[PDB]
């Protein structure tokens, strides 16, 4: 069933979009390009604190009628970081600032075989939340996170 959503921009501006629950995130970001002029691969859509990811759909994030999305600049550029288990060995990961902490765990599970529900990442004495990105924590390049455990 058709649906209206609202996208607030950093420039004190709220855009109305005509969408469907089946619409993919990339399909929505394209609509935002036509209206706001921002390249899809540079848009970071936020909802309830969760980053809407490409390949998914609005329904996957339970986006209901008249929901409000926030648009910010998706920070781009490949770089490497390090993850040292508290034991501990160190592995090197190729990431972008816009990669979520949940994404980082999936990459750790890919080479260390560690299930995400067992992974707890630390940096600067803080616990990194799955929903947020590396950017949100100012994780510099060459930084070393601490996996627990």
């Amino acid at each position: 069933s058709h649906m209206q959503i609202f996208v607030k921009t950093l420039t004190g501006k709220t855009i109305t979009l005509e969408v469907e629950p089946s619409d993919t995130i990339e399909n929505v970001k394209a609509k935002i390009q036509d209206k706001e002029g921002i390249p899809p691969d540079q848009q970071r859509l936020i909802f309830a604190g969760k980053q809407l990811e490409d390949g998914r759909t609005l329904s996957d994030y339970n986006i209901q009628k008249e929901s409000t999305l926030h648009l910010v600049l998706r920070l781009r550029g490949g770089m490497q970081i390090f993850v040292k288990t508290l034991t501990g060995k160190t592995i090197t990961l190729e990431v972008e600032p816009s990669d979520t902490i949940e994404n980082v765990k999936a990459k750790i599970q890919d080479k260390e075989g560690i299930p995400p529900d067992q992974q707890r990442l630390i940096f600067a004495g803080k616990q990194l939340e799955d929903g947020r990105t590396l950017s949100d924590y100012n994780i510099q390049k060459e930084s070393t996170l601490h996996l627990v455990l």
Partner: antibody, heavy 118, light 108 residues
Framework: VQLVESGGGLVQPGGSLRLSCAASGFTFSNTYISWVRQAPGKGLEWVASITPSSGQTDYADSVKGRFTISADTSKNTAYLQMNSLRAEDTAVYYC????????????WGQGTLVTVSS | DIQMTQSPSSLSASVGDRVTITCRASQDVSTAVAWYQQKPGKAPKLLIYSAKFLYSGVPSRFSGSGSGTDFTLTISSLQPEDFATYYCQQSYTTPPTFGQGTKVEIKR
């Protein structure tokens, strides 16, 4: 909402100098910060950019090697360390904010004059 | 480096006139072009981005067009405050590059 610059002034050839670019009303979260200079009677030239929240950097060839762009995320302030300065480094230095799309400067600071002379 | 060539380097016009500046890229840059306005002793301001998208706070008399290598900045009705220097820029690739500038002066 603006960018406030300082640190500019008078320095001799081969000398060093540091510029500061303090943010007001906005944070460096989800932004690139750039330095653009303007020589007297000249146009605009991009000096360097940075992703404050990752420390990633980019420099123009005519300056890549002598200058260093850094940021203090804690205080939403960007810096520009200028070493081995030259007469042709004389210009007005702007710091600009990008938060819409890469390389587009949606906010420019007041400006600070850098002059390299004996 | 991608070269951005503006034309003309200077143009004279009177208030209320319709003005059009052209920007040429040395190669294809799709719609990744931005326009800035600057004034003596002042910092530049963003006017147009992604070729034809108006930035916040910018009068609707400013308009952008074009894609590829040929772009244009149009001012529907020149106003006393519109008399300044205009720079185009490509945000298509690194390093970002500006045009030489086009100064719009008053006619008399």
């Amino acid at each position: 909402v603006q960018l406030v610059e300082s640190g500019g002034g008078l320095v001799q050839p081969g000398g060093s100098l540091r510029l500061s670019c303090a943010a007001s009303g906005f944070t460096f979260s989800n932004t690139y910060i750039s330095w653009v200079r303007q020589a007297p009677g000249k146009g605009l030239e991009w000096v360097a950019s940075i992703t404050p929240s990752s420390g990633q950097t980019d420099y123009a060839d005519s300056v890549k090697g002598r200058f260093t762009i850094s940021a203090d995320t804690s205080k939403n302030t960007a810096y520009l360390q200028m070493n081995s300065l030259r007469a042709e480094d004389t210009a007005v230095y702007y710091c600009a904010r990008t938060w819409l799309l890469r390389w587009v400067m949606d906010l420019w600071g007041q400006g600070t004059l850098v002059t390299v002379s004996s | 480096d991608i070269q951005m060539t503006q034309s003309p380097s200077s143009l004279s016009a009177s208030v209320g006139d319709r003005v059009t500046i052209t920007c040429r890229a040395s190669q294809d840059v799709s719609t990744a072009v931005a326009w800035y306005q600057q004034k003596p002793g002042k910092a530049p301001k963003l006017l147009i981005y992604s070729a034809k998208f108006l930035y916040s706070g910018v009068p609707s008399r400013f308009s952008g067009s074009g894609s590829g290598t040929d772009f244009t900045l149009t001012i529907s009705s020149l106003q006393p405050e519109d008399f300044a220097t205009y720079y185009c820029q490509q945000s298509y690739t690194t390093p970002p590059t500006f045009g030489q500038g086009t100064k719009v002066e008053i006619k008399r």
